[PDB]
Structure 1
Amino acid sequence: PIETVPVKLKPGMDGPKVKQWPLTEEKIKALVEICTEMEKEGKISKIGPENPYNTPVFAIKKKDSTKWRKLVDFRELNKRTQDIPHPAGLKKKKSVTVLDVGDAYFSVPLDEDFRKYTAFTIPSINNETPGIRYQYNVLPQGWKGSPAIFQSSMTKILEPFRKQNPDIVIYQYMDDLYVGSDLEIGQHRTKIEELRQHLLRWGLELHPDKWTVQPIVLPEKDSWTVNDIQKLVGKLNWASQIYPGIKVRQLSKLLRGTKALTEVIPLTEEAELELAENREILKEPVHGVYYDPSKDLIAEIQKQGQGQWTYQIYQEPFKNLKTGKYARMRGAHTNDVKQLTEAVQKITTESIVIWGKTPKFKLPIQKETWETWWTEYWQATWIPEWEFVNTPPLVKLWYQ
């Protein structure tokens, strides 16, 4: 039917060989039901152990629906896969809706020589059965090459809608379609449903206006102790690595000698003025920060406690492209891991809308803790890369 496009791995790289992690009974039953239907329609085929590659698979369940979604953790294959103006107006729209257009890829065949690398394995409960393996025959959801090959077909489908609605920005990333407009809520939702009816012929909410930056703030006191000024000097000293205009001469000279931490230090007029000048400098935007599409985005997250989470997105140290906060549930039934997984999704969603790329996360969590529960709270169709850090208690104190 459709001529296949030859795709190959990067030079000197083999396919992915990543082990399947344990899946719950509800996820395996969902994956088994999905794979039997996908196999019935020629989308996947069973394979044996002579295929040496493997990529982990799981499933997520949307909030209020008994429908599951098959997720293949393809980011190892995406890195090994051989390699458009990002819409700058998407981040300045009133409402943006995310639509899963992953089903569109299933109508385009995949290069026969490449299907071996799409292998995955369905596990069984209590190892009743060996793992049952499959590979992809069509463009797979979650693969970096799927939106690339389907690019020409996606433009044909979106052409009439984009012409009829020029004030609506439609952007595609992986299996997701981002639709932003300045229409009033309700009118916007009518256009989203209109586009859904448009996508059904072929077959088969975000408010980026309110995304604000969290600047570095400084304490305000009528009475300063030696401890208060020591905490303030160390914070401004770190901040001067980001804002070279920060000076700490008049504040630190108040600490000369060997004093008790609870001793009261009256701020002199010079130290008082130096502090006020530092507050204005911290309001200014970081200078000389230019986004490099060829370098990775790095996202660091700090647990601030009481449901508060701060994060920074940079490519070079102290060159923050964005610094924000993510405050959530403030109770005794708080789930740290759940709030963290939700935080990395919101941060990734923002990075896609702003720069069109997914960031690499430095997660403040034990590796085993994250891998045990992170899939239980995932709701996105993409998965970002992440490493696990042993955070210093210093960066936590700097970003409040």
Structure 2
Amino acid sequence: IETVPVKLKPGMDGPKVKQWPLTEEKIKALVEICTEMEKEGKISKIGPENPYNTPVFAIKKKDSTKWRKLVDFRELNKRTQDFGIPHPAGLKKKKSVTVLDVGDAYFSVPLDEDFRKYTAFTIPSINNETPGIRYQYNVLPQGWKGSPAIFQSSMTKILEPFRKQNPDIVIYQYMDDLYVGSDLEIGQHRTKIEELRQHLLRWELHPDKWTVQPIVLPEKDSWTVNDIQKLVGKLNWASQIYPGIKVRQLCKLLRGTKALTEVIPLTEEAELELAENREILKEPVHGVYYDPSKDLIAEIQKQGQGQWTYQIYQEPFKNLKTGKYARMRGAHTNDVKQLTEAVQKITTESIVIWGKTPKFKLPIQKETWETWWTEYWQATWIPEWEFVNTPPLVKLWYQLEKEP
């Protein structure tokens, strides 16, 4: 077909990211996958005269025992020009949502000749005994931001019928995936989804259940100096979020070099102060509104025992959402597994809610992450991340989140 001219943002140059080492198992998977696509004319071998490169790798989705190729177009996407493109604030309210992989659709559409060079990627070899196998795309690449964009037209058409005959169902497209949400009970929903599949071929989520949990304070019959000390610390720090939280009356009980184990009776003044603080903590802070022009940020904290806590915010302490996460069954011995899973769920929610991926602040060493993240990844997209050192205080606070 006639190709739309795609360009890089002015002054930018193509990505030149080096390939990470890959296991035998997945190098094989990729070679096979690529020889096939080459035959089908999706991609072509290139020479050294093309200096650009982008990392590639293979993953298998849950309920999938067939390898699926995945490219890291983050760098390219960032350099690819922007281009109308919606987000239904109602998808966040649906009773149930279903994600669909509509990546394949892109391989039908041709990619502008002049931009092809920039999509160069390399299949490496074990122990460098052979040169890398260099390819480049000829059609629209999966995981690229331009693809859903250019395919927009064809997409709307294809969906319009199901839409007009089912305006009670929400459909949202974010890259390779399509999110279909409906309030219809499981029966009609699943059946209507299968129907939608067929509709495409021919050519489970629960959104608001994600309620922000309040911070609960401990209750004892008798409090010790240590207990109070721990409590006061929590509150003092917490005052950065809720300025109405006071800690003087309690601090008063803490005057004197008493043994930590010493039991202390609460003064009627202290009792009030505490009761009052619990009240303020019964609900999220006022004044927090999402600003579409600013990046979304997600912080995660290892809580041990398989628990993890996270916060989505744009400005520190002004959290849009917060939540806890318990490890999936199977990862009973490894953090990297639980973390990637967590990262994926969180990114998804960000998508459903704001249609935007949060920049992550991960409590892990870069090396550890780079070495094994691919082994557990199961999403068409790859969010941004940085590696940080979890402050002891922020951890102790969110540990206090309410549970069922």
Equivalent pair of 1:20/1:57 in contact (CA under 8 Å): yes
Greater mean deviation of Cα atoms: 305-314 or 183-192: 183-192
Spell out, residue by residue over 1:130-176, the C-alpha distance to the aligned partner (whole angstroms, 9 max, x if none): 11111111111101111111111110011000111111100000100
- Displacement, 1:369? 0.8
- Return closer, same or farther for 1:332/1:12 CA change in 2, 3 Å cut-off: closer
Distance in 2, Cα, partners of 1:8 & 1:289: 37
Spell out, residue by residue over 1:23-53, the C-alpha distance to the aligned partner (whole angstroms, 9 max, x if none): 1222111111111111112111111222121
Equivalent pair of 1:348/1:384 in contact (CA under 8 Å): yes
- Displacement, 1:331? 9.4
- Displacement, 1:323? 0.6
- Displacement, 1:13? 2.1
Equivalent pair of 2:331/2:338 in contact (CA under 8 Å): no
- Displacement, 1:333? 3.7
User: Equivalent residue of 2:70, what SS?
Assistant: strand
Spell out, residue by residue over 1:88-138, the C-alpha distance to the aligned partner (whole angstroms, 9 max, x if none): 111211221110000011111112221111111011123231111111111
Distance in 2, Cα, partners of 1:215 & 1:27: 44
- Displacement, 1:332? 9.5
Equivalent pair of 1:307/1:334 in contact (CA under 8 Å): no
Distance in 2, Cα, partners of 1:260 & 1:13: 64
Distance in 2, Cα, partners of 1:331 & 1:160: 41
- Return closer, same or farther for 1:329/1:161 CA change in 2, 3 Å cut-off: closer
Equivalent pair of 1:310/1:399 in contact (CA under 8 Å): yes
Distance in 2, Cα, partners of 1:210 & 1:255: 41
Equivalent pair of 2:143/2:175 in contact (CA under 8 Å): yes
User: Equivalent residue of 2:386, what SS?
Assistant: strand
Runs of 5+ unmatched residues, structure 2: 400-404
Greater mean deviation of Cα atoms: 153-162 or 229-238: 229-238
Equivalent pair of 2:331/2:337 in contact (CA under 8 Å): no
Distance in 1, Cα, partners of 2:338 & 2:74: 23
User: Equivalent residue of 2:100, what SS?
Assistant: strand
Spell out, residue by residue over 1:340-391, the C-alpha distance to the aligned partner (whole angstroms, 9 max, x if none): 1100000001000000000011000111111111111111111111101121
Greater mean deviation of Cα atoms: 21-30 or 188-197: 21-30
Greater mean deviation of Cα atoms: 20-29 or 58-67: 58-67
Equivalent pair of 1:312/1:323 in contact (CA under 8 Å): yes
Spell out, residue by residue over 1:73-96, the C-alpha distance to the aligned partner (whole angstroms, 9 max, x if none): 111111111113311111211221
- Displacement, 1:330? 8.3
- Displacement, 1:302? 0.5
Spell out, residue by residue over 1:243-262, the C-alpha distance to the aligned partner (whole angstroms, 9 max, x if none): 12212121222212333222
- Return closer, same or farther for 1:303/1:104 CA change in 2, 3 Å cut-off: same
2:184 corresponding residue in structure 1 = 183
2:243 corresponding residue in structure 1 = 244
Equivalent pair of 1:306/1:330 in contact (CA under 8 Å): no
Spell out, residue by residue over 1:191-244, the C-alpha distance to the aligned partner (whole angstroms, 9 max, x if none): 111111111122xx1111321212222111122122211111111122111112
- Return closer, same or farther for 1:369/1:255 CA change in 2, 3 Å cut-off: same
Distance in 1, Cα, partners of 2:333 & 2:393: 24
Greater mean deviation of Cα atoms: 324-333 or 49-58: 324-333
Distance in 2, Cα, partners of 1:332 & 1:70: 24
- Displacement, 1:329? 5.2
Greater mean deviation of Cα atoms: 91-100 or 244-253: 244-253
Distance in 1, Cα, partners of 2:265 & 2:98: 53
Distance in 2, Cα, partners of 1:378 & 1:54: 21
User: Equivalent residue of 1:284, what SS?
Assistant: coil
Distance in 1, Cα, partners of 2:331 & 2:48: 48
Distance in 1, Cα, partners of 2:126 & 2:330: 35
Equivalent pair of 2:123/2:132 in contact (CA under 8 Å): yes
Greater mean deviation of Cα atoms: 316-325 or 12-21: 12-21
- Displacement, 1:63? 2.5
TM-score, length-normalised on structure 1?
0.96
Greater mean deviation of Cα atoms: 268-277 or 6-15: 6-15
Greater mean deviation of Cα atoms: 381-390 or 219-228: 219-228
User: Equivalent residue of 1:42, what SS?
Assistant: coil
Distance in 2, Cα, partners of 1:59 & 1:364: 25
**Number of residue equivalences:** 397
Runs of 5+ unmatched residues, structure 1: none
Equivalent pair of 1:72/1:142 in contact (CA under 8 Å): yes
Distance in 2, Cα, partners of 1:222 & 1:15: 66
- Displacement, 1:183? 1.4
Q: Percent identity?
A: 100
- Return closer, same or farther for 1:138/1:331 CA change in 2, 3 Å cut-off: closer
Distance in 1, Cα, partners of 2:19 & 2:69: 14
Distance in 2, Cα, partners of 1:379 & 1:243: 38
- Return closer, same or farther for 1:296/1:160 CA change in 2, 3 Å cut-off: same
1:130 corresponding residue in structure 2 = 131
Equivalent pair of 2:72/2:382 in contact (CA under 8 Å): yes
Greater mean deviation of Cα atoms: 27-36 or 307-316: 27-36
Equivalent pair of 2:237/2:393 in contact (CA under 8 Å): no
